[PDB]
Short mmCIF file of C-alpha atoms and ligand atoms in Angstrom, two decimals:
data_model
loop_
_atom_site.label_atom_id
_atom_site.label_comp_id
_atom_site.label_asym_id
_atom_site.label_seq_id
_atom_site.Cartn_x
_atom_site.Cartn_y
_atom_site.Cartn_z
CA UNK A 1 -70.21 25.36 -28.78
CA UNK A 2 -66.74 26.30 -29.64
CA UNK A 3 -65.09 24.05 -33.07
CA UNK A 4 -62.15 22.46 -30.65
CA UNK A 5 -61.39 21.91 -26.88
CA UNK A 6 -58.74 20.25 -25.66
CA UNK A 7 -58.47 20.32 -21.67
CA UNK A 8 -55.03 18.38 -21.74
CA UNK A 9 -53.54 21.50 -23.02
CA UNK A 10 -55.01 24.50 -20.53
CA UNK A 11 -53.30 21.79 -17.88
CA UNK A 12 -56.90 20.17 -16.34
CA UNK A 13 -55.68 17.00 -16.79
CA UNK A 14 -53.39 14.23 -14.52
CA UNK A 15 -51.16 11.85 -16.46
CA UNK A 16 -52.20 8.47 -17.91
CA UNK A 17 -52.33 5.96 -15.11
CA UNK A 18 -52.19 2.24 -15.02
CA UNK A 19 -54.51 -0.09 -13.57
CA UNK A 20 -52.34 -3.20 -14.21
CA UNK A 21 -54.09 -6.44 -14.29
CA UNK A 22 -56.78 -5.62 -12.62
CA UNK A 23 -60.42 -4.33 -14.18
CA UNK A 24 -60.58 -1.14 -12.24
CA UNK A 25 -61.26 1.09 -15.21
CA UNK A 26 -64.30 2.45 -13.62
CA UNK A 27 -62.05 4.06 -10.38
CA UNK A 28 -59.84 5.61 -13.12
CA UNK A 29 -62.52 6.58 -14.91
CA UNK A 30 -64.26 8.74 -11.48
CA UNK A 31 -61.10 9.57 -10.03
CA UNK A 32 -60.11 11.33 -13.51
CA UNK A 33 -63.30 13.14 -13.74
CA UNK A 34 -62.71 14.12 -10.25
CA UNK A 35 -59.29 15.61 -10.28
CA UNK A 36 -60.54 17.68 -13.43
CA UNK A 37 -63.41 19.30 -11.70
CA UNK A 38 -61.35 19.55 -8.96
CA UNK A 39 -58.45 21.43 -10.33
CA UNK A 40 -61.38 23.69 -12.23
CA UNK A 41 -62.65 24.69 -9.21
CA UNK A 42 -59.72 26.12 -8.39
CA UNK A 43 -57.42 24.02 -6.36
CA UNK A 44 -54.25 22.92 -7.79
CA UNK A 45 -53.80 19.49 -10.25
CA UNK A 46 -53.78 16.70 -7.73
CA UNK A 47 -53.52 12.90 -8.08
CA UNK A 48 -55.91 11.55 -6.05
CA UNK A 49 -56.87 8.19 -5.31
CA UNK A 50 -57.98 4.92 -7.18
CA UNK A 51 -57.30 2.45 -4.47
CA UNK A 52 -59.63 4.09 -2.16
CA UNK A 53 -62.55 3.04 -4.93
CA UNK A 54 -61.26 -0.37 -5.64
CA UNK A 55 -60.83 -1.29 -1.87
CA UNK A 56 -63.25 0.87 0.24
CA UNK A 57 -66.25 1.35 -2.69
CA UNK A 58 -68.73 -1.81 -1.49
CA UNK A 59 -71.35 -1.01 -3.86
CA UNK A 60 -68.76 -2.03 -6.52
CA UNK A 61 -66.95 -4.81 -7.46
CA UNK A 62 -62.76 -3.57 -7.03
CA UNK A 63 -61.01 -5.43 -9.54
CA UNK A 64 -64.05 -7.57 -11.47
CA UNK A 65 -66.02 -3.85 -12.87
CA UNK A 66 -67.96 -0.92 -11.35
CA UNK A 67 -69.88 2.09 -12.19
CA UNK A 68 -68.77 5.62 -12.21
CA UNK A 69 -71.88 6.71 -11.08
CA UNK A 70 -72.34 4.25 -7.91
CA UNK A 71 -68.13 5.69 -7.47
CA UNK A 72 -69.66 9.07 -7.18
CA UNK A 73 -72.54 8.19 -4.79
CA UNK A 74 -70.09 6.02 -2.86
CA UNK A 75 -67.52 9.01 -1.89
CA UNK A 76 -70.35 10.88 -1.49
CA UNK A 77 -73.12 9.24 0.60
CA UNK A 78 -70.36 6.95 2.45
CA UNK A 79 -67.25 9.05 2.38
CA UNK A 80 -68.43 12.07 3.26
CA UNK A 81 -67.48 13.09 -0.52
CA UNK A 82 -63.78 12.82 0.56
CA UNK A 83 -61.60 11.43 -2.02
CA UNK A 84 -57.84 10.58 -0.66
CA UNK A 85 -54.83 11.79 -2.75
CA UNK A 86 -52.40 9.35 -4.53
CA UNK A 87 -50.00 9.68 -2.58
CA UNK A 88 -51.76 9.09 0.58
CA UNK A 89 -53.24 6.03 -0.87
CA UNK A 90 -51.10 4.66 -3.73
CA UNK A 91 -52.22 1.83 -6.21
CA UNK A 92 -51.16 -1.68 -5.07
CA UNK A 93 -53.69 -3.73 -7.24
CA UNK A 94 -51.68 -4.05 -10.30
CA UNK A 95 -51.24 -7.84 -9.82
CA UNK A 96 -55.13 -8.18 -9.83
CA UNK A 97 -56.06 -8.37 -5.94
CA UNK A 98 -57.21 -5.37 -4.37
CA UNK A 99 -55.98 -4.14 -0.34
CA UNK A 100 -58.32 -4.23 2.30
CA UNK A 101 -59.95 -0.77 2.87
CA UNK A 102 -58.07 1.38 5.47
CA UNK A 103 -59.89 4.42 6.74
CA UNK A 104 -56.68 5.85 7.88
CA UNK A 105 -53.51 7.58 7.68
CA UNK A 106 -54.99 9.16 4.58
CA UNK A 107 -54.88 12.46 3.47
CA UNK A 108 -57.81 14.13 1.91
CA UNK A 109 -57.23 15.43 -1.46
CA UNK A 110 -60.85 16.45 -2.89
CA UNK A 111 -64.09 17.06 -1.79
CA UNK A 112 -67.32 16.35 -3.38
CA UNK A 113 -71.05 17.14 -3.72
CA UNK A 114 -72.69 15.23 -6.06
CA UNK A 115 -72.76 14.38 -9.62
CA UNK A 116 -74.66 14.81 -12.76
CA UNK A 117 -75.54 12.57 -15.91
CA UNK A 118 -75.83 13.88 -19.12
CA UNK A 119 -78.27 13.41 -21.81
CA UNK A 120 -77.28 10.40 -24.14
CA UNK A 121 -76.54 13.35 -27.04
CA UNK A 122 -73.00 13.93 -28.21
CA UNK A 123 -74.02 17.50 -29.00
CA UNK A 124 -74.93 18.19 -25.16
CA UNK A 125 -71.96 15.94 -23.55
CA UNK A 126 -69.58 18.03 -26.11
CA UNK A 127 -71.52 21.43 -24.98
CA UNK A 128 -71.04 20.73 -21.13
CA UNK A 129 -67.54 19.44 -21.39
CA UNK A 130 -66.88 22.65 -23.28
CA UNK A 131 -67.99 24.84 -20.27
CA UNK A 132 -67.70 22.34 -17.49
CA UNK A 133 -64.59 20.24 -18.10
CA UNK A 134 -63.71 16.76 -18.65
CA UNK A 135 -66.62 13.95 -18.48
CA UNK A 136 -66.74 10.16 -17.67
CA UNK A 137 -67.56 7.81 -20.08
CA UNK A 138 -68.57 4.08 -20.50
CA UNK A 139 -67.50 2.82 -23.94
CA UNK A 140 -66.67 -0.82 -25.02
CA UNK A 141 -63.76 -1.19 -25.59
CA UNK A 142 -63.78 -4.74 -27.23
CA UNK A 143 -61.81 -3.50 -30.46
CA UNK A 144 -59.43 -1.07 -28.36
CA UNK A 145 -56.90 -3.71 -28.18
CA UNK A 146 -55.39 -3.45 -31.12
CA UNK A 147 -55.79 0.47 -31.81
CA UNK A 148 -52.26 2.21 -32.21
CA UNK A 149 -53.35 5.32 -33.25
CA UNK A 150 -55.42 7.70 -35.66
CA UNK A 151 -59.27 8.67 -35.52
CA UNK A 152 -61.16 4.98 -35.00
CA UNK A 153 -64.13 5.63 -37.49
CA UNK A 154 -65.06 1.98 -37.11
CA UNK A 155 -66.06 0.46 -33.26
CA UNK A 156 -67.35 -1.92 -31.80
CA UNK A 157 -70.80 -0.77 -30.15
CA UNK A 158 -72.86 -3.87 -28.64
CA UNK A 159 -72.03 -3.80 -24.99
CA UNK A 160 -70.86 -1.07 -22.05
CA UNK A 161 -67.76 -2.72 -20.89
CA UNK A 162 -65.05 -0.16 -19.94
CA UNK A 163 -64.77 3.32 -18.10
CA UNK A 164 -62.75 6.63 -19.78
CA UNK A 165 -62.29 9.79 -19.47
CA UNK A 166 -63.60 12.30 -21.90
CA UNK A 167 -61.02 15.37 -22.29
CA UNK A 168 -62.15 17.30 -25.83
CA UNK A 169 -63.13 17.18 -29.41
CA UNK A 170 -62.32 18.69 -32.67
CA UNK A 171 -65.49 19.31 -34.99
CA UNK A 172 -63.53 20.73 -37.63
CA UNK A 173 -61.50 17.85 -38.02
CA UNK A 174 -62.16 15.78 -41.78
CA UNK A 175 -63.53 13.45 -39.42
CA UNK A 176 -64.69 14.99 -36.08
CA UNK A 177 -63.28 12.97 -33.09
CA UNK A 178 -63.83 12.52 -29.43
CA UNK A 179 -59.72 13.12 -27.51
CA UNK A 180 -60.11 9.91 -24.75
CA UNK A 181 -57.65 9.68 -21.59
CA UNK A 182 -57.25 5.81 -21.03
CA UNK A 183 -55.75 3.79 -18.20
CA UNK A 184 -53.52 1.36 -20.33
CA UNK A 185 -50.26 3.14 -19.67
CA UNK A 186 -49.07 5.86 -22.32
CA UNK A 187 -47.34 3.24 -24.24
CA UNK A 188 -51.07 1.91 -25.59
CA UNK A 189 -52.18 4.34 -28.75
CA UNK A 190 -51.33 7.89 -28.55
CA UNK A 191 -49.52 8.30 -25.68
CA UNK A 192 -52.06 6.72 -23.68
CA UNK A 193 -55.47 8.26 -25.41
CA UNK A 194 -57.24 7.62 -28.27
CA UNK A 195 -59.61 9.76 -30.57
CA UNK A 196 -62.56 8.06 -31.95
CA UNK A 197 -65.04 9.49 -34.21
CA UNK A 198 -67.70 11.87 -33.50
CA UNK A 199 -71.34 11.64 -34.23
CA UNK A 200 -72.21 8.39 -35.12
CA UNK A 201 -72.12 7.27 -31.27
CA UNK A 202 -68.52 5.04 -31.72
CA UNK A 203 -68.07 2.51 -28.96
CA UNK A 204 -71.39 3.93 -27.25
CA UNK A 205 -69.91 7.09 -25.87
CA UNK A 206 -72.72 8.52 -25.66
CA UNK A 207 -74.84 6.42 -23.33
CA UNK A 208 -73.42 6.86 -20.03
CA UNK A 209 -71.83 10.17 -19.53
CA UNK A 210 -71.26 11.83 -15.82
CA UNK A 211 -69.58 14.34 -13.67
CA UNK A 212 -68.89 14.60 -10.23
CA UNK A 213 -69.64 18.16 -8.74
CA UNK A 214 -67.64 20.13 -6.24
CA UNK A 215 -68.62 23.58 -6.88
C1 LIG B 1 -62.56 -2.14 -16.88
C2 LIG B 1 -62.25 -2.94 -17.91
S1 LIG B 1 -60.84 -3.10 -18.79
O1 LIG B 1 -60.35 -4.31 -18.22
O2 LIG B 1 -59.97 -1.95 -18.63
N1 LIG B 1 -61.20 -3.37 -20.37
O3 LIG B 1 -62.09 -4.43 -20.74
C3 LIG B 1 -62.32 -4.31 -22.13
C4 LIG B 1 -63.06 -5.51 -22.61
C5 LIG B 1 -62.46 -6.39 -23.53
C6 LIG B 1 -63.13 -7.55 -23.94
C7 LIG B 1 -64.43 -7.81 -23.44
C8 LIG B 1 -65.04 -6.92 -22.53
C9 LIG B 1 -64.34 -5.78 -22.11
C10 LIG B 1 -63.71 -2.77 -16.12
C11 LIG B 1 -63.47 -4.31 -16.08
C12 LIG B 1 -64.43 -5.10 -15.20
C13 LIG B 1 -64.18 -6.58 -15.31
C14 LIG B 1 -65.31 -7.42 -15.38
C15 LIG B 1 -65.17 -8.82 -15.40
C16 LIG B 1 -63.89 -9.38 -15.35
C17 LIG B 1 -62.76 -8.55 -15.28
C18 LIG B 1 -62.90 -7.15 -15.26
N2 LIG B 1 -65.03 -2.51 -16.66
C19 LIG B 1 -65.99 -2.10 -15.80
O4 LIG B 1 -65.71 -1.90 -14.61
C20 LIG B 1 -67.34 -1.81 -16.38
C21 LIG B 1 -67.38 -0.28 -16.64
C22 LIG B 1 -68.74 0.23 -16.99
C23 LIG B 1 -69.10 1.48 -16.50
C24 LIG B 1 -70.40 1.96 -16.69
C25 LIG B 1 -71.34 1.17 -17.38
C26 LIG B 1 -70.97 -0.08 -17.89
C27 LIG B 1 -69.67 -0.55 -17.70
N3 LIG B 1 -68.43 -2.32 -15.49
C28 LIG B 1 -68.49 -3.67 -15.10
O5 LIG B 1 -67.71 -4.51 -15.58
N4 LIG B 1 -69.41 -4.03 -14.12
C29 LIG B 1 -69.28 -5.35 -13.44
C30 LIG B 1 -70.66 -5.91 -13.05
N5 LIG B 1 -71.42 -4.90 -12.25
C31 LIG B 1 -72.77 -5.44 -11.97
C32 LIG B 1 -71.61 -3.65 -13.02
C33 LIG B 1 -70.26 -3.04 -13.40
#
């Protein structure tokens, strides 16, 4: 696999959101992934939707957690893998209480196949994200509140808590890190990311790593 990718800088990637008070890290977590592959398969960057999760996505739980994978089977087996735009369907649960679900007046932004989870090996997640694109990632984030910045060689791994967005690495790095788009606004760490050390499976990257498909 190549030493260093970066999709933030060949333009794959939306800018960092905010989910507010509300623990919808999961939608933000999908939704990224999605307008990634999206864009990659050849359609321009488009913000699409996080509300549509958090409000219309059942098999979750909107503003108290989700998965990124039941996200992806959600749009997919009850959406007919349509996933509204942003704009369409703008984020209103920043105070912590989510819409109802409207089915309408929306405007469809992405389509959908499927998805596909990757081995638990940094190696292979790296290798795929290299060639495929940006991949979502559970991590706990437990310790995360009081990074500012740098390569965090030292996390907290004892429990899956939190949904990201993996966008690159650098292996040639003194310390090879992991580049991670967050939904904390960009005034939390870098700009709204964070790099955390690769290898040594920091914050439990590794263990539950997806990608929606489109084609
Ligand atoms: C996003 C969380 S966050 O609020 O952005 N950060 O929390 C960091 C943190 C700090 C201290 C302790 C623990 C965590 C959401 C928050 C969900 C939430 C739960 C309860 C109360 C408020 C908010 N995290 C999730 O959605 C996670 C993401 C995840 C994805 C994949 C695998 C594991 C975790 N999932 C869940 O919380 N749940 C809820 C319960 N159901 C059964 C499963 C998904």
């Amino acid at each position: 696999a190549p030493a260093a990718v970066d999709w933030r800088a060949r333009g794959a990637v939306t800018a960092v959101k905010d989910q507010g008070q509300c623990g919808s890290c999961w939608a933000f977590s999908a939704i990224g992934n999605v307008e990634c592959q999206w864009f990659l398969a050849g359609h321009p960057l488009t913000n699409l939707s996080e509300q549509m999760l958090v409000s219309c996505d059942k098999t979750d739980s909107g503003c108290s957690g989700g998965l990124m994978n039941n996200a992806f089977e959600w749009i997919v087996q009850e959406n007919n893998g349509a996933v509204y735009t942003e704009d369409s369907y703008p984020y209103a649960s920043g105070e912590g209480i989510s819409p109802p679900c409207t089915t309408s007046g929306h405007t469809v932004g992405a389509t959908i196949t499927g998805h596909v989870e990757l081995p638990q090996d940094e190696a292979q997640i790296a290798a795929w994200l290299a060639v495929n694109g940006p991949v979502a990632v559970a991590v706990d984030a437990s310790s995360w509140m009081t990074y500012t910045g740098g390569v965090m060689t030292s996390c907290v791994s004892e429990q899956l808590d939190h949904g990201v967005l993996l966008v690159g690495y650098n292996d040639s790095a003194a310390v090879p890190y992991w580049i991670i788009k967050n939904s904390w606004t960009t005034q939390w760490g870098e700009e709204g990311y964070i790099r955390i050390a690769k290898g040594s499976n920091q914050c439990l990257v590794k263990e539950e790593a997806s990608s929606a498909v489109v084609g």
